[PDB]
Amino acid sequence: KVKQDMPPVGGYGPIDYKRNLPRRGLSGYSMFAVGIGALLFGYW
Amino acid sequence: MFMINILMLIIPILLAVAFLTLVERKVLGYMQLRKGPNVVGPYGLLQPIADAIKLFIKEPLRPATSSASMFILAPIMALGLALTMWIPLPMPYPLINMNLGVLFMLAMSSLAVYSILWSGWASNSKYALIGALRAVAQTISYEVTLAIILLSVLLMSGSFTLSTLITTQEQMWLILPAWPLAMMWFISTLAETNRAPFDLTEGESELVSGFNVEYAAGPFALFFMAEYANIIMMNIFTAILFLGTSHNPHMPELYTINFTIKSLLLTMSFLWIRASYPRFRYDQLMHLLWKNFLPLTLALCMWHVSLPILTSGIPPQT
Amino acid sequence: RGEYVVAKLDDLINWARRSSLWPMTFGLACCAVEMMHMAAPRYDMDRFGVVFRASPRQSDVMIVAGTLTNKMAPALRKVYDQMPEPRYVVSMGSCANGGGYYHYSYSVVRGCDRIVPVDIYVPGCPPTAEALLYGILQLQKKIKREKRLRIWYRR
Amino acid sequence: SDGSSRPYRCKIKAPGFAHLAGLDKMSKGHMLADVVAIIGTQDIVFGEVDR
Amino acid sequence: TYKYVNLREPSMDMKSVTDRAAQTLLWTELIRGLGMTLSYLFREPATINYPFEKGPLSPRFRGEHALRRYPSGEERCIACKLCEAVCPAQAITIEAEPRADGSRRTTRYDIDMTKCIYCGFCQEACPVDAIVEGPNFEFSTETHEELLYNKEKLLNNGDKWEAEIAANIQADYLYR
Amino acid sequence: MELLQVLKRGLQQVSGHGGLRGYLRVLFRANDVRVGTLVGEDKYGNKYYEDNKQFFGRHRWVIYTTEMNGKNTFWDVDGSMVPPEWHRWLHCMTDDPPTVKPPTARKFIWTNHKFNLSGTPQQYVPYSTTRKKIQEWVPPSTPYK
Amino acid sequence: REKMFEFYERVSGARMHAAYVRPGGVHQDLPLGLMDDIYEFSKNFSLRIDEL
Amino acid sequence: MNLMLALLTNFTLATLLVIIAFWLPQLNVYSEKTSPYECGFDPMGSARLPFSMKFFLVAITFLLFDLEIALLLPLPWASQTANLNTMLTMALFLIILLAVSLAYEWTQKGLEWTE
Amino acid sequence: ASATRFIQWLRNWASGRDLQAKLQLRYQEISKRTQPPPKLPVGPSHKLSNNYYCTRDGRREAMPPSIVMSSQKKAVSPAPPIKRWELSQDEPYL
Numbered sequence A: 001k002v003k004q005d006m007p008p009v010g011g012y013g014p015i016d017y018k019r020n021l022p023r024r025g026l027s028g029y030s031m032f033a034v035g036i037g038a039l040l041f042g043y044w
Numbered sequence B: 001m002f003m004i005n006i007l008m009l010i011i012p013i014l015l016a017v018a019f020l021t022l023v024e025r026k027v028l029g030y031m032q033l034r035k036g037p038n039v040v041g042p043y044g045l046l047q048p049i050a051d052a053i054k055l056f057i058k059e060p061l062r063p064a065t066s067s068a069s070m071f072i073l074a075p076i077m078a079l080g081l082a083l084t085m086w087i088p089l090p091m092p093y094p095l096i097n098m099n100l101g102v103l104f105m106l107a108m109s110s111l112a113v114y115s116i117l118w119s120g121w122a123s124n125s126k127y128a129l130i131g132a133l134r135a136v137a138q139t140i141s142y143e144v145t146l147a148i149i150l151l152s153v154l155l156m157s158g159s160f161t162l163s164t165l166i167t168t169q170e171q172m173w174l175i176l177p178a179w180p181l182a183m184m185w186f187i188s189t190l191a192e193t194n195r196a197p198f199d200l201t202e203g204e205s206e207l208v209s210g211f212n213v214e215y216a217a218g219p220f221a222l223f224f225m226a227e228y229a230n231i232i233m234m235n236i237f238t239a240i241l242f243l244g245t246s247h248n249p250h251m252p253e254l255y256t257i258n259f260t261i262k263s264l265l266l267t268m269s270f271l272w273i274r275a276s277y278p279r280f281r282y283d284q285l286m287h288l289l290w291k292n293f294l295p296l297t298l299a300l301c302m303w304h305v306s307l308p309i310l311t312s313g314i315p316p317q318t
Numbered sequence C: 001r002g003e004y005v006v007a008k009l010d011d012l013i014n015w016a017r018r019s020s021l022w023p024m025t026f027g028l029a030c031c032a033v034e035m036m037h038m039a040a041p042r043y044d045m046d047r048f049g050v051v052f053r054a055s056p057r058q059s060d061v062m063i064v065a066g067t068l069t070n071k072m073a074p075a076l077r078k079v080y081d082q083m084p085e086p087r088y089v090v091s092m093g094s095c096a097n098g099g100g101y102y103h104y105s106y107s108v109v110r111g112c113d114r115i116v117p118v119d120i121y122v123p124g125c126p127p128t129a130e131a132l133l134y135g136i137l138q139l140q141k142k143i144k145r146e147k148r149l150r151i152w153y154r155r
Numbered sequence D: 001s002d003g004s005s006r007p008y009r010c011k012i013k014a015p016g017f018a019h020l021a022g023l024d025k026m027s028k029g030h031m032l033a034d035v036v037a038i039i040g041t042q043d044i045v046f047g048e049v050d051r
Numbered sequence E: 001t002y003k004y005v006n007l008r009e010p011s012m013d014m015k016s017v018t019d020r021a022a023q024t025l026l027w028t029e030l031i032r033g034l035g036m037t038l039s040y041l042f043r044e045p046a047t048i049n050y051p052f053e054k055g056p057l058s059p060r061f062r063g064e065h066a067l068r069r070y071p072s073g074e075e076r077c078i079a080c081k082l083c084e085a086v087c088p089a090q091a092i093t094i095e096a097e098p099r100a101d102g103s104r105r106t107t108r109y110d111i112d113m114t115k116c117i118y119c120g121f122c123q124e125a126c127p128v129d130a131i132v133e134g135p136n137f138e139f140s141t142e143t144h145e146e147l148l149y150n151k152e153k154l155l156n157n158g159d160k161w162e163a164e165i166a167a168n169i170q171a172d173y174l175y176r
Numbered sequence F: 001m002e003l004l005q006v007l008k009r010g011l012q013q014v015s016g017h018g019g020l021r022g023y024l025r026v027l028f029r030a031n032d033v034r035v036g037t038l039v040g041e042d043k044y045g046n047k048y049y050e051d052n053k054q055f056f057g058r059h060r061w062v063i064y065t066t067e068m069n070g071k072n073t074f075w076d077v078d079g080s081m082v083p084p085e086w087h088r089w090l091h092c093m094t095d096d097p098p099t100v101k102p103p104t105a106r107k108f109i110w111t112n113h114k115f116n117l118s119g120t121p122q123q124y125v126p127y128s129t130t131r132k133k134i135q136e137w138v139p140p141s142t143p144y145k
Numbered sequence G: 001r002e003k004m005f006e007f008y009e010r011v012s013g014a015r016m017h018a019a020y021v022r023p024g025g026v027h028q029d030l031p032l033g034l035m036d037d038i039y040e041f042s043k044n045f046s047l048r049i050d051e052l
Numbered sequence H: 001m002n003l004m005l006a007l008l009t010n011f012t013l014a015t016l017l018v019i020i021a022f023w024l025p026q027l028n029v030y031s032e033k034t035s036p037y038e039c040g041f042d043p044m045g046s047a048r049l050p051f052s053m054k055f056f057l058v059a060i061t062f063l064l065f066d067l068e069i070a071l072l073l074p075l076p077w078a079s080q081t082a083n084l085n086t087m088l089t090m091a092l093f094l095i096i097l098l099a100v101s102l103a104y105e106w107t108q109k110g111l112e113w114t115e
Numbered sequence I: 001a002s003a004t005r006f007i008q009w010l011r012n013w014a015s016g017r018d019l020q021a022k023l024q025l026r027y028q029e030i031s032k033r034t035q036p037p038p039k040l041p042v043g044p045s046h047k048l049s050n051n052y053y054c055t056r057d058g059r060r061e062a063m064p065p066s067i068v069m070s071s072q073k074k075a076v077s078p079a080p081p082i083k084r085w086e087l088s089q090d091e092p093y094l
C-alpha cells in the first residue's frame, strides 16, 4: 500500500501562536509605598 | 616598601582586567545560549593570555594622516589615568589616604576623557573624529549630574574622604536612605565608563570602532585595558558609596573578602546589562540626564541638605 | 641551546596567534549567512577564541564570504591592505574560490585570489557552517606550523 | 519566452530595490544612528537588490 | 481578515496612571527584561563540541563529488555527458572514446569545485548513478589548484567513500 | 540535597574516565569530561560514544585516536579522521552504528581511510588526463638534400 | 533558524540553496518522519517569539 | 612623595607597554596599509573639515552648570556652621536658581538640538 | 533536561514562564534517524487506457494573445472594486 509522510489520523495537537506576555508585579501604590518605607527607615 | 605596595596594586589590576574579558565573554555567551571561550586552557582560562600576547606581537600602525605625538600620547594617558584611579580606594586601607579622595577621583575621571578626545582627533579619520565628538556629548550629559549625586550622598558622610564612607555605613548601607541616588548613580557610571547601553564613543554597529578605529595591536590594547579597568574601579566606588562593608581593624581581610564579593557582583551587573538592552541614541542620552536625572538630582540635593538639619543628624566634620 | 629556545618561542607566538583569531566583520553575499551561523549558539565560534571585530586595524583574518564583483574588488583590497600583520585570508564558497555560478559574468572577479593571497579555500555553495568551522580550524593548524623564529635563527 | 528551452529575458523585480531607493526620502530629518535603524526596517538583501 | 498591531488607548484611571508612573520611575519593564537574560544564563547552552560532535545531516546531503562503480569494479559512467549538459555552472568537462575493449568510457572527467554550486543536478541527470554528491563536507584545501578535480581524484573519492555513499543511496533511492 | 547529588556526578566523571590522569587527558584533548556508553572503536583507534539523555547533537561523539596513519594526533585532531562507516552514524544520517549494520564490502573500497592531505606531500595535484591530440611530423635522421 | 535549516537539508540535501521548488511541483517528496519534526518545532516556536 | 611616586610608576608602566608594542613586532609599512580608513573607499575630504555641533547651546550651559557644583561642593562643610538658618537659606537659594535656569532653558527649547 | 529542581525554579521565575514544557533543545520527541522505506503513490496519468497524451497536454493548449485592438456604452474598470477587509475575530487588536 501507499506509504508517504502524512499527518496522524486525528491530526496534530493544537499549536499556540498568539502573543502571551504574562501580567506580573505589584501595583504602583505598593511599590512606591515600599520605596518610601525603606527611605524613612534609612533616614531614621 | 611603598614601591612594593604600588606593584601589588597595579599588577593585580591588570590581571583582574584580563580575566574580566574572559568572564564577560562567558557570561554573555551563556546568556546567549552558548558557551564562550572554553578551548584555550581549561574553561577558557588561558584565553586572555593568548589575546594579550597576540596583540603585543601584532604590527602597530601609525596612520599616514595621524598626528604622531598625540596618537601615541592618548593610549598612554588612558591606561596611566585608569591605574591612578585606584590609589585612593580604601580596601579597606587606601594606598594613598587623601582628604578629598572623591574630588580627586572626579578630577581624574575628567582628565581621562581627553585620552578619548585626543586619540580620536589625532587619528585624522572621520569615524575616529565622530567617536571623539560623541565623547564630548557624553561628558556633557553625565558630568554635572554625577557630581551632584555624589554631593547628596556626602551630606550624610560629612567629608570627601573615601574611608569615612566606611564609618558612615557601619550600621546600615547607604543604599537604604538613598536608593533614588543609587539608581541614578549606577546609570551615570555606565555612561561614565562608555558602557552599554551608552557605548557610543565606540558604537561598533554605527561607527565601526569610533574613536579607536585606527588603533591596532598594543596601542589598541591599552585602550581596552583602560576601559575595563575603569569598569571595575567604578563598581568598587559604587560598593564603597552605597554598600559599605563593615571593617574590623584586627581582621582587615574580612573586609576585603566581603567588599570584593560586592564589587564583583556589581561588575557582573554591567555585563548583564550589556546582554539585555539596545543602545541609546547619543542625543537621547543627553536628554535622559538633563531632563530626568538632573531635575530629580537637584531636588534630592535640596532634600539631603535639609534632611540632616531638620532631623538633627548632621554628620561630624572629622 | 639557541635552537631549543627559538623552537619554544615559536610555539608560544604560534599558539597565541591561532588561539586568538579575530576575523574582520566582512561579508559579501549568501555565504555570509552561514558565517552568521558559525557565530550562532550551535557552533559558537567565540568558544575557540574567534571574535568578529569591525575595524581592519583590529582584525587578523579576512573571511571572503561571497561573490567579489569588479566594483567591489578595490574596496576588498583596500581593507586587506589596512590589516596589520600577520594577516590571513580565508576564501569561503565557490564565488570567492573561483567565481562559482557567476564565473562567466562580465562583472565578477573569477576568484578572490586574483586580488589577495589566500591561505584556506572552503568549498561549497555555501559551505555549511560546520564546513567553514573546519576551514578555520585548518587555518589554526596552519598557523601552528609556522616557523618564523626558527627560520630567522638560521638566517 | 521565445518558444525555445531557454528564457529570452528574465527581469527580476526585487522588493528591496524600490525600498532602498526610498531610503533618502525616509531619512529626512534624522540622525546617523536613525539611518542605521531605517536600513534595518526596510529589510534589504543585496543579492536581490543588485542581482 | 486583518488585525491592528498598535492601535490601543491607555486607560486614565488613577490606578493605571500610577502603575505607569511606577513603571517610568522604577524601571519595572527594564527589570523585567533583565529577568529573561537571567533565565537564559541558567539554561543549558545549545553548543555542540565540534569536531568531537557533529551537526545532524540526512541521506540527501549534497557534499563532495565521487564517481562510483558496479559491484564488479567496472565504472558506472558511460560518458553520456548528461551531467555535463545539465550542470548550471558548466563545472563538468568530459572527453570520451572507445576503451581498448570497446567500452564507452571517459578519458577526461573534471569537476571544477570552485565553479560548482553543489546543486545535485548532475546526480539527478545521471542514468546509472555514476556521479554522486557524497556526504563529505570537510575537504577545504590550502590552494586553489587542489579543488580542480580530474577523473583520478573523483574515482579515488568513490573508492574512499563508497561504503557511506551506497548506504545513503539505499536510504533515499525510493524517493527518487 | 540536589546540590550534593550534582557534586557526586562530577566526581563520578573522574572515576568514569579511569582516574585523574584519564580525566585530565580528555579535558585537555576534547574540552569535555562527560562519560558515555562506548558504542564502538574503529581500526584507527577512534572511540565512539553515545548518551541519549543528552540533547540532539550532543548525544553522539568521537574521541579521536592519538595516532593515525603515522601522524601524531594527540593534539592535532580534525573531522576528516572519521572513516566513512562511522561518518554516517556520527552525523546522524542513520541510527545504526557499523557495529550493528556493517557496510557492504567491495574489493575496490579503501581498506585504509585517509584524512585531509592538503598542505602535505600527499596532496592532490591536478593534471590533464588526456593524451596529446596532434602528432607532429618527425624529420628524417639522414642527410639528403 | 539552525533547526529550520535542518528541514531544508532533509527535503533537499542543502541547508540554504535547496533548489527544491521547481516548475511542476517539488523535486522530491517529504522524507518519512519530517512532518512530525516540523510539528515539534512549531509547537515551541511561539514561546520563542514571546521571549523576543 | 608617595603620590608622585605612584603617578610616575603608573605612567611609566603605560609608556613601557607602548615601547614594547612598537619595537617587538615585525613591521611592514607601505602606503596603502597606513591610508585612512573609511570602509574600503578613499575618504572624500579631509577629516579636519568643520564638524557642526548641534548641541552647542547645551555645551555652553554645561560651563555655567559645571561652575555651580564648585559652589555647591563645600556644602558638607558649610553644614557644620553654627549659623544654620542663613546657611540653609543660601544653600536652597542657590540650588533653586540653578533649577530656575534649567527650567528657563528647557521651556525656551535650549535643550533641543539644532536640526 | 538535566537541570536541578532549584535551577528550574529559578529560571522559571526569572522568565515568568514554565520553560520545561517547551525546551528549545531537542531530546527524544524527534523522529528516528532511520525510517522504514516509503512507497510513494503515482499520478493521475499512470493508466493503461483512456490516457492519450493529446487529451492532457497543457502546453499545446496555450494560445497566442487575443488582439483586442490593433492599428493595422458604460465605463468599465479592470475588475470589480476590491471588497473591504473585515477585522479579525480571532484577535482584532494586538
Ligand SMILES: CCCCCCCCCCCCCCCCCC(=O)OC[C@H](COP(=O)([O-])OCC[N+](C)(C)C)OC(=O)CCCCCCCCCCCCCCCCC
Binding pocket: B052, B053, B056, B057, C009, C012, C013, C148, C149, C151, C152, C155, H017, H019, H020, H023, H024, H025, H026
Ligand atoms: C600585557 C603586555 C603583554 C606583552 C606580551 C609580550 C609578548 C611575550 C611573548 C614574546 C615572544 C618573543 C617575541 C617574538 C615575536 C617577535 C615578532 C615576530 O614575529 O618577528 C618575526 C621576525 C622574523 O624576521 P625574519 O628575519 O625571519 O624575516 C622578516 C624579514 N622579511 C620580511 C624580509 C622576511 O623575527 C625577528 O625578526 C627577530 C625575532 C627575535 C625573537 C626574540 C625577540 C627579542 C625581543 C627584543 C626585540 C628588540 C626590541 C625590544 C622590545 C622589548 C623587549 C621585550
Ligand SMILES: CCCCCCCCCCCCCCCCCC(=O)OC[C@H](COP(=O)(O)OCCN)OC(=O)CCCCCCCCCCCCCCCCC
Binding pocket: A035, A039, B180, B182, B183, B184, B186, B187, B197, B238, B242, B273, B277, B288, B292, B293, B296, B303, E024, E025, E026, E027, E030, E031
Ligand atoms: C520622606 C520624603 C522622601 C522624599 C524623597 C523621595 C524620593 C523617592 C521618590 C522619587 C522617585 C524614585 C525613583 C527615582 C529614580 C530615577 C527615576 C528616573 O529617572 O527614571 C526616568 C528615566 C526616564 O524614563 P523615560 O520613560 O525614557 O522618560 C520619561 C518621560 N520623559 O528612566 C530611565 O532612567 C531609563 C534608564 C535606562 C538605562 C537603564 C539601564 C540599566 C537598567 C537596570 C538597572 C537596575 C537598577 C539597579 C540599581 C543598582 C544600584 C546600585
Ligand SMILES: CCCCCCCCCCCCO[C@@H]1O[C@H](CO)[C@@H](O[C@H]2O[C@H](CO)[C@@H](O)[C@H](O)[C@H]2O)[C@H](O)[C@H]1O
Binding pocket: B309, H084, H085, H086, H088, H089, H092, H093, H096, H097
Ligand atoms: C528664587 C529664590 C528662592 C529662595 C528660596 C529660599 C527658601 C528658604 C526656605 C527657608 C530655609 C531655612 O528655614 C529655616 O531654617 C532654620 C534653621 O535652618 C530654622 O530654624 C530652626 O533651627 C535653628 C537652628 O537650626 C534655630 O535657630 C531656630 O530657632 C529654629 O526655628 C527655621 O525654623 C526655618 O524656617
Ligand SMILES: CCCCCCCCCCCCO[C@@H]1O[C@H](CO)[C@@H](O[C@H]2O[C@H](CO)[C@@H](O)[C@H](O)[C@H]2O)[C@H](O)[C@H]1O
Binding pocket: B291, B295, B296, B298, B299, B302, H095, H096, H099, H100, H102, H103, H106, H107, H108, H109
Ligand atoms: C528644585 C529642583 C526640582 C524642580 C524641577 C526643576 C526643573 C524643572 C524643569 C522644567 C519644568 C517646566 O519646563 C518644561 O517645559 C517644556 C515645554 O517645552 C516641557 O517639555 C515638553 O517637551 C519636552 C520634549 O518633548 C518634554 O519634556 C515633554 O514631552 C514636554 O513636557 C516640560 O514638560 C516642562 O518640564
Ligand code: SF4
Binding pocket: C029, C030, C031, C032, C065, C066, C067, C092, C093, C094, C095, C096, C100, C101, C124, C125, C126, C127
Ligand atoms: S558561493 Fe554560493 S552561497 Fe556563497 S555567495 Fe556564492 S552563490 Fe551564494
Ligand code: SF4
Binding pocket: E083, E086, E087, E088, E089, E090, E091, E092, E111, E115, E116, E117, E118, E119, E120, E121, E122, E123, E133
Ligand atoms: S552539483 Fe550542480 S554545479 Fe556541481 S557539478 Fe553537479 S550539476 Fe554542476
Ligand code: SF4
Binding pocket: E076, E077, E078, E079, E080, E081, E082, E083, E084, E094, E122, E125, E126, E127, E128, E129, E130, E131
Ligand atoms: S551523467 Fe553519469 S554516465 Fe553520463 S557522463 Fe555524467 S557521470 Fe557519466
